[PDB]
Design a protein around this ligand. Structure first.
Ligand SMILES: C[C@@H](NC(=O)CN1Cc2ccc(-c3nc(NC4CCOCC4)ncc3Cl)cc2C1=O)c1ccccc1
Length: 350
């Protein structure tokens, strides 16, 4: 009648509701498949996560689950269901069921020229999702083309909230060259100078990078290592102004910048000769060196480039700010498992 399905070695212990599995992919998170959902009669994405042997996998798992169960928005991936063992003792895996999406913006950019109309619509949707995220006082912190899912009609949904944080602007400052987790090519210049990435402006930078990559099918700042990232940024933006330098009070960071030879700004219309001029005006405001001067999500949405889409009444916000009950670091592997168990109880037969 039935048994545990396998795919590429792994038990996919998702039944009886989810059958007829096909491999999609794999990564540090675990493994993903499409499955036929027998209750909704659609194929769905299912990712098997096995995080309980290291506490960082447990952190990313719990952030993802707690945030995405709280959020409800058309441009943010939901969680449809969660499968796991009936007891903590028996729970070695978590299967998170999500809407199946045809592709992602990373895959699309490696194969497809984007028309200006596509770029405009994708950007609208990224920002409309990010408006909602930021309205819940949450930062995604790892926005990049592979975290933007697309269906066959180019509807876009933001995924992967494992690095997300509640914003904390009063604790954003750090020293020069502080190590960072999120993806290098989409890191704002301030991460490498004086920022822990605890403000909304870090996501706007990444969106800026994504827009540039939509315009040319190539990453704008493909740094090969921590500090090379900053030098790619300054290679295009040019040397910071005295005003922007004076906002960096950390001497090591300031003096690093002062030690560099003077570079002029490469104008956007030379990097992007076929781009719409309104798109480059918005790009410029998103890829501003000084995070205080960088455009905010709601201002970006109101930019002339997006005028055909802009409608604040149809760009919803969250009902209330997000807050974690407990600080998720300094919490052991063993407690994060318990919290995962609790957070997934609603999907159990009961
Ligand atoms: C926090 C957690 N990380 C993740 O869960 C990150 N992932 C992995 C992943 C894989 C697939 C999809 C996906 N893909 C499609 N279609 C594809 C069809 C083929 O072309 C590409 C798109 N459709 C719906 C979805 Cl949801 C979403 C995610 C996601 O968000 C973690 C990390 C470390 C440790 C522990 C937990």
């Amino acid at each position: 009648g039935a048994g545990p399905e396998m795919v590429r070695g792994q038990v996919f212990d998702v039944g009886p509701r989810y059958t007829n599995l096909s491999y999609i992919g794999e990564g540090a998170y675990g493994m993903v498949c499409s499955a036929y959902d027998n209750v909704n009669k659609v194929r769905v994405a299912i990712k098997k996560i096995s995080p309980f042997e290291h506490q960082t996998y447990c952190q990313r798992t719990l952030r993802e689950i707690k945030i995405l169960l709280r959020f409800r928005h058309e441009n943010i991936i939901g969680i449809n269901d969660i499968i796991r063992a009936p007891t903590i003792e028996q729970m070695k895996d978590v299967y998170i069921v999500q809407d199946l999406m045809e592709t992602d913006l990373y895959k699309l950019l490696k194969t497809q020229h984007l028309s200006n109309d596509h770029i405009c619509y994708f950007l609208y949707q990224i920002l409309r999702g990010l408006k909602y995220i930021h309205s819940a006082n949450v930062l995604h912190r790892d926005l990049k083309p592979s975290n933007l899912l697309l269906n066959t009609t180019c509807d876009l949904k933001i995924c992967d909230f494992g690095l997300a944080r509640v914003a904390d602007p009063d604790h954003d400052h750090t020293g020069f060259l502080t190590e960072y987790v999120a993806t290098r090519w989409y890191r704002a210049p301030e991460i490498m100078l004086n920022s822990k990435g605890y403000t909304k402006s870090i996501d706007i930078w990444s969106v800026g990078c994504i827009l540039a990559e939509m315009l040319s099918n190539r990453p704008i700042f493909p740094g090969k290592h921590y500090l090379d990232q900053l030098n790619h940024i300054l290679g295009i933006l040019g040397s910071p102004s005295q005003e922007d330098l004076n906002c960096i009070i950390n001497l090591k960071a300031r003096n690093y910048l002062l030690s560099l030879p003077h570079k002029n700004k490469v104008p956007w219309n030379r990097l992007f000769p076929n781009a719409d001029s309104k798109a480059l005006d918005l790009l410029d405001k998103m890829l501003t060196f000084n995070p205080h001067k960088r455009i905010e999500v709601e201002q970006a949405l109101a930019h002339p480039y997006l005028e055909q889409y802009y409608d604040p009444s149809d760009e919803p916000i969250a009902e209330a700010p997000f807050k974690f009950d407990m600080e998720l670091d300094d919490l052991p592997k063993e407690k994060l498992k318990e919290l995962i168990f609790e957070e997934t109880a609603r999907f159990q037969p009961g």
